[PDB]
Amino acid sequence: CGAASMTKTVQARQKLSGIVQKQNNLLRKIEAIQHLLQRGLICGPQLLHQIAEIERELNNQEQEIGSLKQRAQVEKTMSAASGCGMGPASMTLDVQARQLLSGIDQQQNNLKRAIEAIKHLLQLTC
């Protein structure tokens, strides 16, 4: 029993940072589809395959993100069970890294709502 180390704290920060980056790339791919459909009619499997790959990566991110949240829950509970209490010493992610993760979680739902809206638009339009 003890507290998190610096090589783990940077691993996890860097993990959060990579998710932010993946979300931002997905957003740019969704914006590109949105702009395509503003440019005119593009019916067919071409854009459905890309929508499907985007949902794919979004669902992967849902897991990566739920894992981090639940891993924090494992650390908190194990620490209590070991006689070391809580605080952010027992936690690889501190109150600040946990706050980013709330915004990342929220952005994960925004992106899903958006790719669905886009899918349903193309579905109607076609």
The domain segmentation of the chain, as residue ranges, is 6-125
Q: Which approach determined this entry? A: X-ray
Q: 69 Cβ partners below 8 Å, 6+ apart?
A: 101, 105
- Phi and psi angles of residue 86, each rounded to the nearest 5 degrees, phi first: -140, -125
Resolution at which this structure was determined, Å = 1.7
- Please give the helix or strand (H or E) that residue 1 lies within, else none: none
Q: Which two three-digit tokens encode residue 24?
A: 């931002």
Which 3-state string (H, E, C) describes 77-125? Answer: HHHHHHCCCCCCCCCCCCHHHHHHHHHHHHHHHHHHHHHHHHHHHHHHH
- How far, in Å, CA of 98 to CA of 75, rounded? 13
Q: How many helices (H) and strands (E) does the chain have?
A: 3, 0
Tokens 């899918």, residue? 119
Could you count the other beta carbons within 10 Å of the beta carbon of residue 3? 13
Q: Which two three-digit tokens encode residue 124?
A: 């109607």
Nearest to 30, CA basis, from 125, 126, 121, 104: 121
